[PDB]
């Protein structure tokens, strides 16, 4: 059973780095890319980036370069993975719900989504 | 009818399904066992084909062998054998002559092909 | 009237998946002679005129077969070698002390680790020491009263078993040829500008292919072969940002890499015929390892790559390079293998779009001894040291690039070094051909009637 | 680059009506049902394929660059914003009223 | 020309190289894989030879089968097929009839050899 | 006489035991070696049968090939070859022509069966 | 019926051992439940066929 | 039936030990050298681990 769990909401101040985590379990994590999305209130979904669970390579768009660091930590026997989004130069414009999702196909089809972490600044 | 089909039918009727049975002769440790199995099946097939070749019946299912039938092997009419017996009963009936007849068949091919045919090509 | 006629030996085929034979030309190198047959002497290539064949490099099976074979061979090549389980003990690692001009950067990299291990008798211990590189040492229970009593272990020795490479294994990437089995043949595309996917209209039949060197590297492709006519860009959908871009160059760039230190070796016995090799001491001074890439050749190469990348996208876009976005060390830096030494070289001076006037770019490198090569899969290997300084030279023949995501209201496209998936490097060579299954039995009408 | 359009900006229908939402794109598309809740639910992937667990009310067709997301027998449970995506680009969806 | 040779040539011309393709059908863990490969190649060869034998074409590359051609399978002149098509195009052209025709061929051999020949040997 | 039998006898006499030699061609790590052996024996048998098939001699031990003998291969009377030589001596005598003759045999079958027979079935 | 809360203890480099840690709630014996009348009918029929 | 067995075993490093415990069912425990001075010091092993 594919499952993605996320941490609860966090409230901080501009300039304070914030970490949002997503924990993947119940499937072979190493075979699928994990993507991050940012949904500002009342807006659509902005793409934040993708991380390869096997090599750790992040890929972020221009607007998040130098600000968003995506990483992953494999657990024992690769049964679960903890993925993290560390946002450094935080601003009040970044208030949004941050989602993690699995890419299951070559069409960027996202079947399972996390619950969404609310970040208020 | 499928493999074996009318196994209990008479010898005559069963001759019409010879291709049905003929097509069923071909197709980590466990893989080794399966291999061994495939090799043995191939060897049995090749031995049967070689034996038919030696008798001069290669490529055929029905062939005349030009060897007279001996009254010591069986003494039945054609009607009794083809309409009143199954192949299992016949196989038992002449089991003890299986190898004797085969030797005669080989000798027939030895007499033919070379001794009775090479002299005509000349 | 017309009658059915059967023809056996008809030159037709279908796509199929099968197992290929390894062949190579004539201490036992991993792969090659130990388990391979002789190559086909004086092999022929048969041109098939008026034949068009659809080749997809990405979906080729030969890549998965090569991946599996290489992993299996490597594991066997390590199966009989000395295991380092008895060395996963408490270490006391202090600053190494040398008598000749050690730079302040290297004092933090080479650690003098003292430990108590076994000898070749069950009831006795030895107190020994070795020099290790910092990336291979993990801290436990830091002692804040006396920092020299902190505990250290070899990296990941608590997670799995570290096996020392046998000193008699030849790690040279000797080219291996793949030969099709009976009933099968390999079709090769001779279209010099083939994109790697599509209807190649100039094909030939090959019974057994040429050799491919199983070179392991990241970010840049080494050795292999050059493009016949031009730099070629291959990338699946091209617009899909999770698909690698493979740049196949028509001209190589020479790179020279070295470990200038002597690294005098010490040999310590662990058990009944089980020996361990480690650096004993260093004669002379200590310098960082590095690689040297010619400045003007690299600058020309990047100019041509930018032009060809620009030709494959909207004309109103500038092509720029940027440093790697990060990730594991194996992909952040360029990975080499020179005589068993694994180098992790900082390539941020090559992909920063800085047209540096230097005649020779020099890139600092780290050297690591405990290597888990196949993205965490397999036994951890300990690379023993070699006494004396090491130099090596290789040709850079291609690049692995990743597109830097995507957005609107943007007039430039940023590419970064990528890789880490060994299959892509193997594709950069296997793309030329595919395997077909012969189907010799065909039928057709004609006037042929049996006399019967 | 991949260009996209989305129309209408909002939709209002009665229960049981058949409605369509149009998205145009030169590339692979999928569609998601976004609620004021934990996550969007994927509805359509590929040219026109349904996911497991999706009631047999949602469908689609493509012709040229247009996709219609035909929704048959619209039910109260279908009040949601329907998003359209090409790779990393997600276009704000149509807000359905009912 | 070698294996496959004039693959893109017409059906007529390609009939002169049937032996060239025919000769290419035959010839620690890695050894096991190679073995498996050899066994599969042998099985495919034997299945093709058995099928030709059942059709009554054993030992030949060209054989008449005494089965009329149906207009539903194709409708082309001999010139068009032998001079205006390659074997790949023909193979695709009648792919969906591959098994149907084979059944008729087996039936033809069933009608011959026994039913139409055994009565004459008598 | 058994396998090989009169190995030292003349070429003529030895022709009467061809079936005796023909029947001897077919029938944990050690098992793997034996397997390998069985596979190689099968491959050699199949290669010989395929070669005889290509020459048009399938199913026979003696066959005419319709290829004239060249005086450059040997120059001996029939009496000298069949009554004054053994098969080993003959095998050495024409060893260097073994492949040349085989090519001609293949060409003969190429000329027959299709080019000289297909035109008559029409 | 017991919960038998599990504890995991490491023995070696990737070699782990699982054992019961503690039990939450009360402790009862394990048991099986066989329908009385079905068993009685089954044995009656078995006795008849054996006889 | 349920016994609380304390034991000293290895950890994931060659030079360290762990003192742990587990609950085992009586049929899997074999008695050695019963201590008649303090019954809590009797020795036990896993059944047939010596064989
Ligand atoms: C892309 O392609 C390029 C092109 O190929 C790749 O770059 C090339 O890669 C190859 C492969 O590594 C390199 O070849 C090696 O070169 C070295 C250098 O040799 C010089 O020094 C020799 C003397 O050695 C003494 O000094 C050195 C330090 O200077 C010291 O390390 C050594 O222990 C010893 O003390 C000279 O003999 C040698 O001259 C010879 O070679 C010249 C080549 O150009 C030639 O011109 C000369 O005429 C003469 O023939 C040269 O001056 C070699 O040392 C090394 O030799 C190893 O491999 C050969 C091949 O079988 C073998 O015969 C040797 O015995 C030796 O093998 C030892 O190491 C193996 C490690 O795998 C081991 O398996 C063996 O059993 C053996 O082990 C023994 O020694 C070790 C060491 O202590 C010991 O622990 C063991 O117990 C045992 O006693 C290779 O020939 C090329 O130099 C390099 N560059 C070029 C331009 O070709 C590039 O890498 C590719 N890309 C990638 C990513 O890989
Ligand atoms: C990177 O990814 C992108 C996707 O993200 C990928 O794009 C695909 O690439 C393929 C190959 O090029 C495209 O195929 C072409 O599409 C052209 C336009 O779309 C066609 O298909 C539409 C789908 O309709 C269905 O029904 C038709 C039959 O009706 C069927 O063929 C389809 O398979 C599908 O089942 C169709 O609606 C559309 O018809 C509209 O447009 C035409 C053109 O104006 C118009 O006449 C119609 O009235 C209607 O308005 C059209 O049929 C198409 O033009 C093109 O056709 C050429 O090739 C075919 C043979 O392949 C010839 O028969 C034809 O005469 C043309 O020569 C071809 O079919 C596919 O559409 C893309 N997919 C998507 C989702 O965008 C890139 O290729 C990828 N790049 C790389 C490097 O990998
Ligand atoms: C092998 O050992 C490493 C660490 O090495 C040493 O041995 C362990 C058994 C412990 O005794 C360590 O104290 C000791 O240094 C294991 O990796 C380590 O895992 C721990 C968590 O179990 C990490 O600690 C925490 O990590 C979080 C990360 O979010 C921090 O927020 C915490 O503050 C704390 O640092 C520790 O950092 C980590 N060490 C390294 C170098 O990564 C490793 O898991 C173990 N292998 C197995 C199979 O257990
Ligand atoms: C690494 O540490 C070891 C251990 O201290 C050093 O070897 C010791 O050197 C001192 C001084 O010469 C001797 O008195 C000890 O007996 C040595 N110990 C052993 C076990 O031999 C070694 O010199 C250090 N190496 C470097 C490069 O600093
Ligand atoms: C290896 O063994 C030696 C000898 O027992 C250890 O040296 C002792 O270390 C302790 C501190 O841990 C000191 O109090 C003793 O005085 C030392 N003994 C001597 C003779 O000097 C050494 O610490 C051990 N190292 C490891 C990693 O186990
Ligand atoms: C198609 O590919 C073949 C290769 O198989 C090309 O033939 C080669 O041409 C070069 C240049 O004349 C020769 O040096 C090679 O010896 C040829 N190879 C063989 C096997 O003869 C052929 O030119 C290509 N055709 C096109 C149109 O690109
Ligand atoms: C490699 O294949 C491509 C694709 O077929 C060839 O490019 C085509 O060339 C013809 C001219 O002969 C043009 O009409 C097509 O439009 C081209 N297509 C593409 C996609 O570029 C290319 O010429 C081939 N290479 C060689 C050396 O023949
Ligand atoms: C790599 O390039 C550097 C240049 O920075 C070389 O360093 C020079 O080496 C020569 C001797 O070979 C010295 O005379 C120069 O003074 C050095 N200059 C500097 C700045 O270090 C280095 O030798 C080259 N290495 C290789 C293997 O080619
Ligand atoms: C590779 O080297 C570069 C520098 O050549 C590193 O980036 C910068 O290094 C300087 C110190 O030389 C720092 O002051 C900068 O802050 C670094 N840049 C950043 C963005 O942090 C780079 O980090 C090195 N990469 C690796 C993997 O070691
Ligand atoms: C097995 O049968 C026993 C009957 O003896 C069941 O025990 C009863 O369980 C119910 C609840 O399920 C209680 O209300 C009764 O008071 C219990 N009676 C007794 C005598 O224990 C037991 O639950 C059954 N177990 C299963 C799995 O069916
Ligand atoms: C079995 O015997 C009966 C006797 O009447 C016959 O009708 C039937 O056909 C036989 N079975 C087969 C398969 O021939
Ligand atoms: C039939 O067999 C017997 C015993 O083998 C033999 O004596 C008899 O001569 C044989 N009949 C003929 C006609 O050969
Ligand atoms: C074959 O011989 C055995 C004795 O060994 C005999 O019992 C059996 O009836 C014989 N069968 C035939 C068909 O002669
Ligand atoms: C090692 O060197 C550093 C200098 O970077 C120094 O601060 C530290 O105290 C040294 N360690 C010992 C044990 O002397
Ligand atoms: C490599 O290709 C480029 C075209 O991109 C061309 O200008 C250059 O001359 C080529 N180099 C060689 C050595 O063929
Ligand atoms: C690199 O090439 C560019 C042209 O693309 C040129 O402007 C620049 O000066 C070159 N730099 C060096 C160091 O050669
Ligand atoms: C140390 O380096 C010198 C050259 O500077 C060399 O002659 C000597 O053999 C080297 N010794 C070792 C042990 O590597
Ligand atoms: C470094 O290696 C080169 C070539 O292998 C050699 O010429 C040079 O003398 C070596 N230097 C030392 C100090 O060993
Ligand atoms: C690099 O390429 C050149 C030109 O083909 C060649 O001469 C040289 O030997 C190559 N270098 C290596 C290490 O193969
Ligand atoms: C969507 O519906 C409209 C209704 O008029 C129609 O014109 C259009 O062609 C449809 N498009 C698709 C892809 O079904
Ligand atoms: C390919 O077509 C041309 C058309 O003129 C023909 O001359 C040529 O012989 C054909 N190729 C083959 C191998 O027959
Ligand atoms: C040709 O095939 C069709 C369909 O199988 C069949 O109806 C027709 O009778 C066949 N023609 C002949 C002459 O049998
Ligand atoms: C061997 O030679 C002698 C010569 O007289 C002959 O009689 C004998 O038959 C020969 N051996 C064989 C097996 O023919
Ligand atoms: C016999 O062989 C020679 C050499 O191969 C050849 O010159 C001669 O023409 C051949 N004889 C005949 C009749 O073909």
Copy the structure tokens of residue C318: 């500038």
Q: How far is the CA of F71 from the centre of ligand 23 (A)?
A: 29
Name the phi and psi angles at F96, rounded to 5: -75, -5
Cβ(C408)–Cβ(C361) below 8 Å: no
Pocket of ligand 22, candidates E67, E69, E70, E100: which has the most ligand atoms within 8 Å of its Cβ, to mutate? E70
- The token duo for C418 is 């990528």
Question: Beta-carbon neighbour count of residue A64 at 10 Å?
Answer: 23
Contacts of C161 (CB under 8 A, 6+ apart): C83, C84, C85, C379, C380, G13, G14
Contacts of C241 in chain D (CB under 8 A): 87-88
Q: Are B40 and B25 in contact (CB under 8 A)?
A: no
Residues 6+ apart with CB under 8 A from D41: D32, D33, D34, D35
Sequence-separated contacts (24+) of C91-97 with Cβ below 8 Å:
C91/C115, C91/C137, C91/C151, C91/C152, C91/C153, C91/C154, C92/C148, C92/C149, C92/C150, C92/C151, C92/C152, C93/C132, C93/C137, C93/C150, C93/C152, C94/C148, C96/C131
Going from N- to C-terminal start, the domains of chain A cover 1-121
Our answer on whether the CB atom of C137 is closer than 6 Å to any ligand 3 atom is no
- Cα–Cα distance between F77 and C115 in angstroms, integer? 90
CA distances from F35 to C200, F29, F48 (A): 42, 10, 20
Residues facing residue C377 across a β-bridge: C374
Looking at residue B25, the DSSP 8-state letter turns out to be: S
First to last CA, chain E: 50
Atom of ligand 1 nearest to the CA of C389: 28
CA–CA dist B33, B55 (Å, integer): 33
Pair B67, B97: CB distance under 8 Å: no
Q: What is residue C39's three-state secondary structure? A: coil
The string of DSSP letters for C272-295 reads TTEEEEEEEE--S----EEEEEEH
Q: What separation in angstroms does the CA of G15 have from each of C83, C158, C159, C170, H20?
A: 16, 10, 9, 32, 16
In a 3-state reduction of DSSP, which class is residue G46?
A: helix
User: What is the β-pairing status of strands C412-417 and D30-34?
Assistant: unpaired
C412/chain A closest Cα distance in angstroms? 10
Q: Which residues contact A110 (CB under 8 A, 6 or more apart)?
A: A35, A101, A102, A103, A104, D30, D32, D42
Whole-number CA gyration radius for chain D: 12
Q: Map residue F70 onto helix, strand or coil.
A: coil
- Whole-angstrom distance, CA of residue C310 vs CA of residue A39: 33
Distance of alpha carbon A72 from the chain centroid? 10
Which chain F residue's Cα is nearest to B121? F64
Task: For residue B70, give the ligand nearest its CA.
Answer: 12
With CA atoms as reference, report the closest residue to C270 among C77, C81, C136: C81
Alpha carbons within 13 A on the beta-carbon side of D96: 26
* Interacting residues of B4 by C-beta distance below 8 A, sequence separation 6+: B20, B21
What does the alpha-carbon distance between residue C366 and residue C334 come to, in Å, rounded to a whole number?
Answer: 10
Please tell me what resolution, in angstroms, this structure has: 3.4
CA distance C5 to chain F (A): 11
Chains interfacing with C (3 or more CB pairs < 8 Å):
A, D, E, F, G, H
Q: Give the number of other Cβ atoms within 10 Å of residue F34's Cβ.
A: 12
First-to-last alpha carbon distance for chain F, in angstroms, is: 50
Residues contacting F23, CB < 8 A, separation 6+: B50, B54
Distances (CA, A) of C223 to C21, C228, C233, D96: 23, 15, 18, 59
Q: How far apart are CA E83 and CA A46, in angstroms?
A: 61
Residues near ligand 7 (Cβ within 6 A): C 191-194, 201
Give contacts of E56 with chain B, Cβ < 8 Å: 59
Cβ-contact D43, D51 below 8 angstroms: yes
Three-state SS string over C409-447 comes to CCCEEEEEECCCCHHHHHHHHHCCEEEEEECCEEEEEEC
Tokens 């941020």 — which residue? C348
Query: Nearest-CA neighbor of D42 among D52, D32, D56?
Result: D32
Check the CA dihedral B78-B81-B84-B86 and report its sign: negative
Answer for the pair E74, E55: CB distance below 8 angstroms, yes or no: no
CB atoms under 10 Å from CB of F19, counted, come to: 17
C-beta atoms surrounding D42 within 10 Å: 23
- Give one DSSP letter per residue of C198-231, joined into a string: EEESSEEEESEEEEE-----SSEEESS---SSS-
The sign one gets for the Cα dihedral C143, C383, C160, H45 is negative
The residue nearest atom 70 of ligand 2, judged by CA position, is D27
CB F61 within 8 A of CB F22: yes
Spatial neighbors of B42 by CB under 8 A, at least 6 apart, are B26, E39, E42, E43, E46, F42
Backbone angles phi, psi at C198, to 5 degrees: 135, 180
Q: Position of tokens 């093709």? A: E48
| Count of CB atoms situated within 10 Å of the CB of C384 | 19
CB atoms within 10 A of CB C342: 20
The candidate with the shortest Cα–Cα distance to E61, out of E101, E100, E25, is E25
Experimental method: cryo-EM
Chain C's closest residue to F122, CA to CA, is C447
Bridge partner list, A84: A21, A71
Compute the distance between CA of residue E25 and CA of residue E20 in angstroms, rounded to an integer: 10
DSSP alpha helix (H) spans, chain B: 11-14, 18-22, 29-54, 78-84, 87-93, 98-110, 118-121
Neighbouring C-beta atoms of residue C318, cutoff 10 Å:
11
- Tell me which residue has tokens 């033809």: E108
Strands C380-382 vs C162-164: parallel, antiparallel or unpaired = parallel
Report residue C243: phi and psi, to 5°: -115, 130
Residue B54: partners with Cβ closer than 8 Å, 6 or more residues away:
B105, B106, B109, F19, F22, F23
**Dist CA C174 CA C212 (whole Å):** 8
Strand-pairing partners, residue D50, are D44
E103 CB contacts (<8 Å, ≥6 apart)?
A: none
Residue ranges covered by each domain of chain D = 1-98
C-alpha D96/C-alpha D21 separation (Å) is 10
Residues D58/D47, Cβ–Cβ less than 8 Å? no
- Please give the Cα distance from C152 to C89 (Å, whole number): 8
- The residues, any chain, with a CB within 8 Å of residue D13's CB and separated by 6 or more, are D19, D74, D96, D97, D98
Strands D10-12 and D89-97 come out as parallel
Taking CB atoms and an 8 Å limit, are F58 and B59 in contact across chains?
yes
Among residues D38, D47, D27, D35, which one has the least CA distance to residue D82? D35
- Upstream peptide bond of D8 is cis (omega within 30 degrees of 0): yes
Secondary structure, 3-state, chain D: CCCEEEECCEEECCCCCCECCEEEECCCCEEEEECCCCCCEEEEECCCEECCCCCCCECCCEECCEECCCECCCCHHHCCEEEEEECCEEEEEEEEEC
Q: What is the DSSP letter of E3?
A: S
Q: Give the helix/strand (H/E) hosting E13.
A: helix E11-14
Distance between start and end Cα atoms, chain H? 23
Give dist(CA C133, CA C149) in Å, integer: 19
CA neighbor of D58 nearest in space, from D66, D67, D87: D67
Residues E11, E61: Cα–Cα separation, whole Å: 15
Q: What is the DSSP letter of C373?
A: T
E98-110 and E29-54 helices, crossing angle to 10°: 60
Residue H6, H or E segment: strand H2-11
- B27 touches E: beta carbon within 8 Å: yes
Topology given in CATH for the domain delimited by A1-121: Immunoglobulin-like (2.60.40)
| Cβ pair E85, B81 in contact under 8 A | no
DSSP secondary structure of C102-145: --TTGGGTEEEEEEEEEESEEEEEEEEEEEEEGGGEEEES--SS
Residue C266, exposed/middle/buried by CB under 10 A (0-12, 13-18, 19+)?
A: middle
Tell me, what DSSP letter sits at residue F74? -
**How far apart are alpha carbons C68 and C80 in whole angstroms?**
20
Which CATH number fits the domain D1-98, given the four candidates 1.25.40.10, 2.60.40.10, 1.10.10.10, 3.30.300.160? Answer: 2.60.40.10
Residue with tokens 């130990």: C34
State the pairing for strand pair A10-11/A117-120. Answer: parallel
Question: For residue C180, how far is its CA from the centre of ligand 20 (angstroms)?
Answer: 51
Ligand nearest to the CA of C347: 9
Strand partners, D91: D84
CA pair distance B28, D67, nearest whole angstrom = 51
Whether F contacts C, i.e. 3 or more CB pairs less than 8 A apart, is yes
Cβ atoms C324, C331 nearer than 8 A: yes
Cα angle H31, H35, H40 (rounded to 5 degrees) comes to 80
Q: Tell me the C-alpha to C-alpha distance, in Å, between residue C129 and each of B65, C210, C264.
A: 88, 48, 14
CA distances for D9 relative to A38, C50, D6, D17, D96, angstroms: 21, 54, 7, 18, 9
Which chain D residues touch C240 with a CB distance below 8 Å? Answer: 87
Of F23, F26, F58, the CB nearest to B58: F58
Alpha-carbon radius of gyration of chain C:
27
CA dihedral sign, ordered C235, C237, C239, C242:
negative
CA distance A21 to A100: 9
d(CA C163, CA C171): 16
Residue B7: partners with Cβ closer than 8 Å, 6 or more residues away:
B14, B86, B87, B88
**Which backbone phi and psi does G2 adopt, to 5 degrees?**
-85, 155
Dump the DSSP string for C325-338.
Answer: ---SHHHHSEE--B
Contact C339, C104 (CB under 8 A): no
Residue owning tokens 């190579």: C24
Q: Token pair of A65, please?
A: 């370069």
CA pair distance C227, C267, nearest whole angstrom: 46
C-alpha to C-alpha distance for D80 and D63, rounded to whole angstroms = 25
Rounded CA-CA distance B66/C131 in Å is 91
Burial B20-35 (b: 16+ CB within 10 A, else e): eeeeeebeeeeebeeb
**DSSP conformation letters of B38-51:** HHHHHHHHHHHHHH
C325 lines ligand 9 (CB under 6 A): no
- Would you give the DSSP letter of residue A64? G
Which ligand is the nearest neighbour of the Cα of C302? 16
C-alpha–C-alpha distance, residues D70 and D20, integer Å: 5
CB of A65 within 8 Å of a chain C CB? The answer is: yes
The pair of three-digit structure tokens given for residue G14, joined into one six-digit string = 């990737």
Q: Chain H contact for G13, CB < 8 A?
A: yes
């Amino acid at each position: 059973q594919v499952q993605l769990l996320q941490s609860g909401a966090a409230v901080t101040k501009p300039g304070a780095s914030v970490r949002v985590s997503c924990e993947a379990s119940g499937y072979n994590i190493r075979d699928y890319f994990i993507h991050w999305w940012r949904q500002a209130p009342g807006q659509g979904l902005q793409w934040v980036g993708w991380i390869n669970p096997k090599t750790g390579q992040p890929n972020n768009p221009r607007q998040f370069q130098g600000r968003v660091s995506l990483t992953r930590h494999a657990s024992w026997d690769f049964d679960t993975y903890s993925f993290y989004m560390d946002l450094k130069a935080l601003r009040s414009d970044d208030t949004a719900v941050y989602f993690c999702a699995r890419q299951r196909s070559d069409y960027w089809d996202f079947d399972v989504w996390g619950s969404g972490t609310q970040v208020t600044v | 009818l499928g493999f074996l089909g009318a196994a209990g039918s008479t010898m005559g009727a069963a001759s019409m399904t010879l291709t049905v049975q003929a097509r069923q002769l071909l197709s980590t440790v466990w893989g080794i066992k399966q291999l061994q199995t495939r090799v043995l099946a191939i060897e049995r097939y090749l031995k049967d084909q070689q034996l038919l070749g030696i008798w001069g019946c290669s490529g055929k299912l029905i062939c005349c062998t030009n060897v007279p039938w001996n009254s010591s092997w069986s003494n039945k009419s054609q009607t009794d054998i083809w309409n009143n017996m199954t192949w299992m009963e016949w196989d038992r009936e002449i089991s003890n002559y299986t190898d004797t007849i085969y030797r005669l068949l080989e000798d027939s091919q030895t007499q033919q092909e070379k001794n009775e045919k090479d002299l005509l090509a000349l | 009237n017309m009658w059915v006629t059967v023809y056996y030996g008809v030159p037709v085929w279908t796509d199929a998946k099968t197992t290929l034979f390894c062949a190579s030309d004539t201490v036992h190198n991993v792969w090659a002679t130990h388990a391979c047959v002789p190559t086909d002497p004086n092999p022929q290539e048969i041109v098939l005129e008026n034949v068009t064949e659809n080749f997809n490099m990405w979906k080729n099976d030969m890549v998965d077969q090569m991946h599996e074979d290489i992993i299996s061979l490597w594991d066997q090549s390590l199966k009989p070698c000395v295991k380092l389980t008895p060395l996963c003990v408490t270490l006391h690692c202090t600053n190494a002390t040398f008598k000749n001009n050690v730079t302040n950067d290297m004092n933090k990299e080479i650690r003098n680790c003292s430990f108590n291990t076994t000898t070749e008798i069950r009831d006795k211990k030895q107190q020994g020491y070795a020099l290790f590189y910092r990336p291979d040492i993990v801290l436990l229970k830091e002692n804040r009263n006396n920092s020299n009593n902190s505990e250290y272990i070899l990296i990941n020795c608590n997670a799995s078993t570290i096996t020392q490479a046998c000193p008699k294994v030849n790690f040279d990437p000797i080219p291996i040829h793949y030969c099709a089995p009976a009933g099968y043949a390999i079709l090769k595309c001779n279209n010099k500008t083939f994109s790697g996917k599509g209807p190649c209209n100039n094909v030939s039949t090959v019974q057994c292919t040429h050799g491919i060197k199983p070179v392991v590297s990241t970010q840049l492709l080494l050795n292999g072969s050059l493009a016949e006519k031009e730099i070629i860009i291959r990338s699946e959908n091209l617009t899909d940002n999770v698909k690698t871009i493979i740049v196949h160059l028509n001209k190589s760039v020479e790179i020279v890499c070295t470990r200038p230190n002597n690294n005098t070796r010490k040999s310590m016995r662990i058990g009944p015929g089980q020996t361990f090799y480690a650096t004993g001491d260093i004669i002379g001074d200590i310098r960082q390892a590095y690689c040297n890439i010619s400045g003007s050749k690299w600058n020309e190469t990047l100019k041509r790559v930018k032009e060809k990348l620009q030709e494959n996208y909207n004309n109103n876009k500038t092509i720029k390079f940027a440093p790697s976005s990060g990730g594991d060390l194996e992909i952040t830096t360029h990975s080499f293998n020179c005589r068993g030494e694994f180098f992790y070289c900082n390539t941020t001076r090559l992909f920063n779009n800085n047209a540096t006037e230097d005649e020779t770019i020099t890139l600092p490198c780290r050297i690591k001894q405990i290597i888990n090569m196949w993205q965490g899969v397999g036994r951890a290997m300990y690379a023993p040291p070699i006494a004396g300084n090491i130099t090596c030279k290789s040709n850079i023949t291609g690049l692995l690039l990743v597109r830097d995501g995507g957005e609107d209201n943007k007039t430039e496209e940023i590419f970064r070094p990528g890789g880490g998936n060994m299959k892509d490097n193997w594709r950069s060579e296997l793309y030329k051909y595919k395997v077909i299954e012969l189907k010799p039995l065909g039928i057709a009408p004609t006037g042929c009637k049996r006399r019967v | 680059d991949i260009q996209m359009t989305q129309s209408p900006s909002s939709l209002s229908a009665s229960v049981g009506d058949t409605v369509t939402i149009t998205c145009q794109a030169n590339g692979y598309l999928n569609w998601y049902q976004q609620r004021r809740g934990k996550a969007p639910k994927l509805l359509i992937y590929d040219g026109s394929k349904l996911e497991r667990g999706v009631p047999s009310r949602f469908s689609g067709r493509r012709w040229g660059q247009e996709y219609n997301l035909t929704i048959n027998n619209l039910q109260p449970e279908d009040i949601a914003t329907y998003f359209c995506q090409v790779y990393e680009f997600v276009v704000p969806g149509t807000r359905l009223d009912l």
